[PDB]
Design an enzyme around this catalytic site. Sequence first.
Site, short mmCIF file in Angstrom:
data_model
loop_
_atom_site.label_atom_id
_atom_site.label_comp_id
_atom_site.label_asym_id
_atom_site.label_seq_id
_atom_site.Cartn_x
_atom_site.Cartn_y
_atom_site.Cartn_z
N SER A 103 49.44 15.08 52.06
CA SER A 103 49.80 13.94 51.24
C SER A 103 48.77 13.46 50.18
CB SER A 103 50.19 12.74 52.11
OG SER A 103 51.30 13.10 52.91
N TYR B 156 55.84 3.89 54.29
CA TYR B 156 55.31 5.13 53.68
C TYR B 156 56.27 6.28 53.94
CZ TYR B 156 51.85 8.95 53.24
OH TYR B 156 51.12 10.08 52.92
N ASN C 118 57.87 10.33 52.54
CA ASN C 118 58.05 11.49 51.66
C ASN C 118 59.37 11.43 50.94
OD1 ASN C 118 55.72 12.57 52.62
ND2 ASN C 118 56.72 14.04 53.99
B1 LIG Z 1 51.22 13.14 54.38
O1 LIG Z 1 50.10 14.10 54.67
O2 LIG Z 1 50.73 11.84 54.85
C1 LIG Z 1 52.51 13.65 55.14
C2 LIG Z 1 53.34 12.79 55.86
C3 LIG Z 1 54.46 13.32 56.56
C4 LIG Z 1 54.73 14.63 56.50
C5 LIG Z 1 53.90 15.50 55.75
N1 LIG Z 1 54.21 16.95 55.70
C6 LIG Z 1 52.80 14.98 55.05
#
Ligand SMILES: *[B]([O])([O])C1=[C][C]=[C]C([N])=[C]1
EC number: 3.5.2.6
Length: 358
Positions: A61, A147, A149
């Site tokens: 992320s 939060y 994706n």
């Molecule tokens: B990120 O690294 O915070 C993240 C959150 C959830 C899933 C993924 N693949 C990355």
Amino acid sequence: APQQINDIVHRTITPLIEQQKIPGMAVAVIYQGKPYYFTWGYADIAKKQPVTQQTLFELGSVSKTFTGVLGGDAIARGEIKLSDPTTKYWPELTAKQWNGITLLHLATYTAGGLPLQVPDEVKSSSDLLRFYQNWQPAWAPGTQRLYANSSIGLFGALAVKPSGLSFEQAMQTRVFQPLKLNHTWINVPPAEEKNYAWGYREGKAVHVSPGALDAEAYGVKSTIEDMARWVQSNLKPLDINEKTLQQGIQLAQSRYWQTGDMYQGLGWEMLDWPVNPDSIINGSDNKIALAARPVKAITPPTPAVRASWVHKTGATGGFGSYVAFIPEKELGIVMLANKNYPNPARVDAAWQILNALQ
Ligand SMILES: *[B]([O])([O])C1=[C][C]=[C]C([N])=[C]1
């Protein structure tokens, strides 16, 4: 490096690697604008390949910061506005819950409860449409941060639509290339595979699996050198010659929402400097970072504040990354590891290093 940076980094990172059983690690400190690099351990345990300054790590992320800046650049180009409804770029999104959900909400996780992960089951473009059409918000837009994706990932896919470019082509041509991030990839080419570290999860070598909106939410791989350069670019956007990119970087550090003592940017998250280190350390733990929290709108957004701790954590199954910087001090750090170890340990180490140098 100056012995001070050397001692401060080694005294902090050595015990971290020992406590966390991290197989391989690279660190860059940006001090008065110059980078200093440090590496330990193994990119590939089985083949005995060491971590070098050319090793590619999965950023997870931390990719959201590139997505946020690419979005900012599209705004600066006049291609999109954060105030635009989501439906302006995806007219097939006809379900009524999308009324009032704008690109700003998607970029900042405030659409009303879009989930952390896009379901595995969602592959195709039509699976994706179906998922968003059927998604039911728990909250009104612009009221709660969760939060996600599925939130900023969709922002990135929509932000590049008017350019006509694929997400990857837009990212390459408008961000990677102008910044000379020539070893930063959404898809690692065969020629660079020799440098792609394995991630380690429960002792098994793993790489990130394909998934919907992966490029836009968590799919960048990069080296410690390119990541130092990313930090320098975000520390000092006025050195950047491409006008819209300079502006996009500024927009991504604007403060759009506040929850507790953190401010949500585009991909970046920010706190006032000097920070309370317990606040950023405890705040980084997923118990807080992934929680649903009410937000206060910053009306209008505060432009990028130089006296900020600006940062982002990232993880994939096998990798753990962290970047943090303080514009007013010309100071920053990148920590790339091939194990996903707990966030608070990352932030603690980062704060110990930067506090000792400021
Ligand atoms: B990120 O690294 O915070 C993240 C959150 C959830 C899933 C993924 N693949 C990355």
